[PDB]
Subunit: 336 residues, 5 copies
């Protein structure tokens, strides 16, 4: 029996290696296999990965006439001491078990141990949609020991920045992913002490042209369409009135349609500002012709009682586009 | 073996410490890590947190030549007595188990015990949407012993109001969160007796300006647009009629669009009252011109058989806006 | 050890108390804590509650110099005999286990036992939507023994109608809840025999005014708006035609919008009948003016070849509203 | 102890009764309690039922001075041999366990055994939507032994067609259910051999009138409305043009609305054919008036340069309805 | 006892057969039972299948006076050595367990073993929607050993391309499935070594005619409808203006409706290009008439101050359709 080569029954494996002295170093490597989903309303993401640990234990040494190592599956884990890592700020997670538990242990003649397992985790990521669709988000995944302070266990990246590998075809449907890297930082708990924490960081971006074409293009076209009425004969009331009112109706349908297709986040975003400013421009263009028609009617009635282009149209033909151009300059200087 | 330092086999751990005498005090601390989601239709919320217990047991004392404590994981829990806390008014919950059970026990030489675990819970929160979108909601989470009355176990906050800590970046997507605090109260069960209950309270609010801009602004603009027809020449029937009917159509589309984007709660809310009053104003403006056209036609026919601005327009130009202003004053004095 | 006070090893606990003789009575009490959700398309509901059992077993008696009782948690359940209750017509259910199993046992010196546990259950409830939104539904939850017939186990409510308690703040978002009460009935299985079954009954109702304002009000307003054209000068074709066709378009949008917000139940309901009758009225009002215009044109052409209000408008002004009023009387006498 | 009346330790229960000789017959009965849901996009259904087995084993015989039988729960199952049935073509399933496992065993003095359990299963059902909404679907549930060929185990319906019972109130929200019955058939696996398979069959149908009123009625009404323009004076251009274009807009909104309410199945169905043919009719009616207006204008210009009803309207008034009637005859002769 | 015919206690089953020498070959067969679902936003699919292994172990040989084999269920698996296969790039999976674990073992007198189990798996499949709805996708499922390198275990398809069988009625609701086949490839891990990997490949396609009729047909019809105004008398302003503006409104509603029914993928696809080009054509047709009306008005005013078909219409009648035809030629030569 291979488990008799390790004196299992001859040691207390409820205490750590080196108990009573300096802390035992434990080195970590990570391989990311995929990014599974993201939730914008609930603000979290899901990832699948391999986690590997390295440490030394002299109680595990066995004699050999060679330099061959022995390999075990997850049934040995409950018989020896292993590190207790957990994921900070996570909502749910599990270890894969088909067709059997996805756990491996390899033990060297001198007591060096490698511990490997496959896991899926869902973690939180606070997001800010104030600059949507031009926003940028940063997320992280964090790794920590549950019960051992830095005085008993010293956790570190085994090879620095070479300790993280990512799959060549990692991708998300609605985001672009860039800039993977690792960091470390000490954290403090008033109940027990100081602990080491490791981080995995990355950044997300959207596709800007899709949103430009889908939202900003039609609004601008409808605003430009509402200026056509300034060049139409003011005596054609049955053609001036329906045009303005239908233009309002079209802009309202566009805004409702856009609202139905964005994530349900209930506070004010940049695209909303653009859309409602354009709606106000369309409203003002109807008020203009109302004024013109009233004034013309008054003039005609006065002339008959006593017995060309109106100035408002001439000024509006210049003033409306200039003000829209100035709004656009300010908006795009502010939101980049 | 460390479990032989505690005389495990030498005591009955199916009875409480101090059995037969006064109740044993048990002190509680809570650290909230995050707020995961909220459901407005089902009226509940989800939270993730650390729960810590403190008590003393003389049967656990062990000799030491030092003041060092021993630490265990969750396999020891089934061998000793521990408190049986549960969450009142909850729908589902679980304890995290990756990469192993997230449970810790620390035992002092004199028998003081600390018990720590990590848990996620979903709890109910009755809500009232009568003043939507200006409503305010209050929620709570409650903690109680399942089987021990106040005569056997005394449950209390360890440090009063300093016993609750919350994460610095706790947030929800559609709500603002404020005013965390703790309370206690005795409850009575006719089947067994009196029990101590602990509470965690907080308050939620919405973003008012988003809703103002999205709902109240367009309705008011359309009501103001329907008043334009009072200044148009009454002889232009083909321009007066289509304008009113298209204005009705636009207001109906706006109302349907707003209805599709609120949570599906089927009783009457404030915003509904605002919207349907505005719809009635738009309807009345079409009835006005119907009356005017009929009366003008009668007058002309009478004059021809025998062989300026109509008064109704002049009065309507004043009466409609005053009545809308009075409605707005009353509405906003009532709903703040 | 407290489990040695009960002679556990000295009795066969795979047989019932009183085996071989009359049936053992078992009394039941229920406390409802909350109503969690309801599903109209799948026709089921979810509930969370406490279930308590009472019976006597002389094999459990122990000596005492006092009248104190002993309390156990769920680890004792597998060592003694307990009743096997299950929920009839249910789809899924589970027993809460945080922070430990929510099970209690209390044993009196003379062998009286109390058994308590906390459970969540989803059960079916056949529904009829023919009179929507004026429908009423009745639901029930049923409790039965799986393996013991009335000859071996007699199941009954411990205190009659006082055996059911409900929480003071029980509520559902879209329903009103009323009239909780209990009943009993015998059921028969051809495979094994007769069994006792217990019932918990309640009733659900909707908020009628919300639905009135959201659906019936706009339809009636549009039908009334289509009658305006009967008072308009028949020589204004460019004002009579667009009005009818836009009125049809508005009514169609209203009907689509209403259809998108009701539960997806694919058979005919009362509100559908109301809406499609109103649509038919709006269609008929356009056919009327088509007839009037054709006849006027014929008359003018005839008069010119040879070389006031038309009767159809005068009759329509009376006939349309009377017929709508009669439809409303019949409809509301039929559907209450 | 009742388990000592059966010589449990005295037989190898890892082999079947009658090992080494002819196959052992096993008889099956089924009671369906409910139909829980159906998924049209994923093409599956869910059902809840009781499954009962009957067979004889002489190793289970025990002496009795009477004809009373002994009853056990599911803890005995792991100590004796039982049949290994499984559900073919299923996606997921489980056995109910509240408040304990829903399993029963009854053993007669002579070794006759009854085995009963309660189970929920989700199974696939390939569907064809080509004739929607006039389609008919057939589904089945299949039962088979996992490891024993017909040479070792003979599986059959205990009582033929009397072996299946269904609940009196079984129903689905959007379907009608009819024609339950059972069948049997042999299947062949090249890896191991021939096996017996049992079937449960039933049929589903929709409510036709709901779909008629919701879809076919409005389309036909709009097609009939577009024919009104053939009777309108050809000199009223501002009344002929808006009518056709608004009629197109109404038909497009109707089609979009209908599309949003059917199950998302992306291939061509009958109702789509009806709707797009009607759209083409509405398009052609606008092309007609375009032609008429152009020709009239040419004639007038020619007459002035040189210095009644147009035939196209007269022919269209007959030709359009006849062609629609012929389309309807062919369509309804093809799709029933 | 049948487990005493195999000397279970007489061998260490924690090491592989042939330990210390050449690798042991293991042969694999697969039978696909169904394709359960596909997720376009999350980019994955689900499948249910039978997995079978073949290998030889001399420690399992037993004497027989015949050539009969012994069969076991899944309780034997934990007592002997078996291969540890797992699914690469998968998100979740499980082994069916109703009414018992769906596992079988068959052992020949000479030590040949067959191992069979039933499993459901969800795997990732990166997709590209740039050519939607004319796109083609390829997916695969991959099988690998977790802990043994090619030096210890040699994994291969038992019968080459005859090793894969698929069900005759396998289907998906919105896709067509074709071209199943198998491949093999070596993979390299820097932590442990080289491993053998097996692949199952297939291809998916859509139904093109459904999408043609639903999207491309209405857009083209509306573009053709906007050309009607070039043949209408330029003096009929109240008929030329409403027609263009309503045509814009109809096209906008069509585009919103189409957007609401495609999978929510936020980057630019071919159908979007088609739709927005058609929208631009409709916009240009309104700008044309604006120009024509302005120029006519100028001419009339000049003539009066001093005291037929306009050229722009004549050129537009030719130029618009030619340019649309050229766009269509280029588009369909590019996207096939
Ligand atoms: C072309 C369009 C969208 C389509 C019409 O509404 C016109 C605007 C004009 C301003 C443009 C904008 C696209 C996004 C631009 C290029 C901005 C960016 O650098 C984005 O990061 C700055 C100015 C923006
Ligand atoms: C500006 C707007 C919304 C946009 C148009 O409809 C005009 C109203 C006028 C009344 C305003 C309201 C915004 C919300 C106000 C300020 C109310 C509040 O204190 C909210 O708590 C009281 C009066 C309300
Ligand atoms: C006011 C309104 C709805 C709003 C407009 O459509 C007008 C109808 C008129 C008939 C009313 C109905 C509301 C519901 C009533 C009162 C019915 C009920 O007792 C309901 O149980 C009987 C008559 C119904
Ligand atoms: C009344 C209506 C629907 C409502 C308008 O579109 C007119 C058609 C006319 C043809 C009818 C159809 C209803 C369904 C019928 C009766 C068909 C069936 O036997 C159905 O199985 C054959 C002819 C069909
Ligand atoms: C008939 C229709 C759609 C309906 C109207 O928009 C007109 C176009 C004309 C061009 C056609 C297209 C259908 C798809 C075709 C046949 C393309 C394909 O081979 C598809 O793989 C090449 C040319 C395309
Ligand atoms: C670097 C190292 O570990 N080398 C060892 C060597 O010491 C040992 O003698 C040999 C036995 O075959 O195996 C190898
Ligand atoms: C406050 C306290 O517990 N102090 C103890 C002290 O009594 C003990 O002698 C010493 C042994 O090293 O450890 C410390
Ligand atoms: C009603 C009842 O059970 N009374 C008992 C009494 O018989 C017993 O002598 C006493 C011992 O303290 O406890 C109490
Ligand atoms: C049909 C049958 O099984 N009858 C039995 C009978 O043989 C037996 O003597 C009796 C003992 O009470 O129980 C009954
Ligand atoms: C090919 C093969 O395995 N043949 C065997 C034969 O060797 C054996 O003598 C016989 C016993 O009945 O069973 C068969
Ligand atoms: C790892 O590399 C990243 C690359 O951006 C850098 O930011 C970071 O500081 C590096 N960390 C260490 C420990 O070298
Ligand atoms: C805790 O502090 C809160 C702060 O609002 C207060 O309301 C509450 O009464 C305090 N409770 C105790 C026990 O001090
Ligand atoms: C319980 O009370 C309800 C109240 O409605 C009554 O209908 C029922 O008959 C009562 N049952 C018994 C057993 O008293
Ligand atoms: C069972 O009855 C059904 C009723 O339709 C019949 O089709 C079937 O053949 C019958 N089967 C047997 C085995 O009698
Ligand atoms: C299996 O058959 C497929 C059929 O396309 C072929 O592509 C593949 O190369 C074949 N593989 C082997 C190993 O024969
Ligand atoms: C309709 C005309 C829109 C013009 C927009 C100009 C935007 C300029 C942005 C300059 C950023 C530096
Ligand atoms: C269209 C004019 C709306 C005017 C609204 C006035 C609201 C005043 C609220 C005063 C609250 C004290
Ligand atoms: C538009 C007028 C609607 C009138 C509806 C009258 C309904 C009367 C119901 C009487 C029930 C007894
Ligand atoms: C608008 C007129 C529709 C007429 C439809 C007639 C359908 C006849 C079906 C005959 C089936 C035998
Ligand atoms: C409205 C006219 C559309 C004409 C489209 C022609 C497409 C030709 C494609 C040729 C591919 C080789
Ligand atoms: C392809 C980018 C288009 C942007 C139109 C505003
Ligand atoms: C837009 C304001 C114009 C004023 C011209 C007098
Ligand atoms: C709005 C009512 C006006 C009445 C004027 C006589
Ligand atoms: C508040 C009830 C309103 C009903 C309108 C029909
Ligand atoms: C609505 C029918 C009126 C007929 C008058 C002659
Ligand atoms: C619809 C075609 C009519 C042709 C009459 C000459
Ligand atoms: C479309 C441009 C036409 C120009 C004719 C002069």
């Amino acid at each position: 029996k291979s488990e008799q080569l390790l004196r299992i029954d001859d040691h207390d494996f409820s205490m750590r290696p080196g108990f009573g002295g300096p802390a035992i170093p434990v080195g970590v490597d990570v391989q990311v296999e995929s990014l599974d989903s993201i939730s914008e309303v609930d603000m979290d993401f899901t990832m699948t990965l391999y986690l590997r640990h390295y440490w030394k234990d002299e109680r595990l040494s066995f004699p050999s006439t060679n330099n061959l190592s022995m390999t075990f599956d997850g049934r040995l884990v409950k018989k020896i001491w292993v590190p207790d890592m957990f994921f900070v700020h996570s909502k749910r997670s599990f270890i894969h078990d088909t067709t059997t538990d996805n756990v491996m242990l390899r033990v060297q003649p001198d007591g060096k141990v490698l511990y490997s397992l496959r896991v899926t985790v869902t973690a939180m990521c606070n997001m800010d949609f104030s600059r949507f669709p031009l926003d940028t988000q940063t997320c992280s995944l964090e790794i920590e020991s549950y019960a051992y302070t830095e005085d008993d266990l010293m956790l570190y990246w085994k090879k620095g920045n070479d300790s993280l590998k990512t799959d060549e075809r990692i991708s998300l449907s609605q985001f672009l992913i860039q800039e993977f890297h690792t960091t470390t930082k000490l954290a403090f708990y008033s109940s027990t002490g100081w602990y080491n924490r490791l981080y995995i960081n990355f950044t997300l971006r959207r596709h800007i042209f899709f949103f430009l074409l889908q939202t900003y293009f039609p609004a601008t076209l409808m605003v430009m369409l509402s200026w056509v009425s300034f060049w139409i004969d003011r005596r054609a009331v049955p053609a001036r009135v329906p045009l303005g009112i239908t233009t309002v109706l079209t802009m309202s349908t566009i805004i409702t349609g856009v609202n139905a297709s964005m994530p349900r986040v209930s506070y004010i975003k940049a695209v909303d500002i653009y859309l409602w400013v354009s709606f106000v421009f369309v409203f003002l263009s109807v008020l203009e012709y109302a004024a013109v028609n009233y004034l013309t009617t008054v003039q005609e009635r006065k002339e008959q009682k006593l017995r060309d282009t109106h100035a408002i149209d001439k000024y509006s033909r210049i003033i409306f586009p200039a003000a829209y151009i100035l709004f656009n300059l300010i908006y795009w200087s502010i939101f980049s």
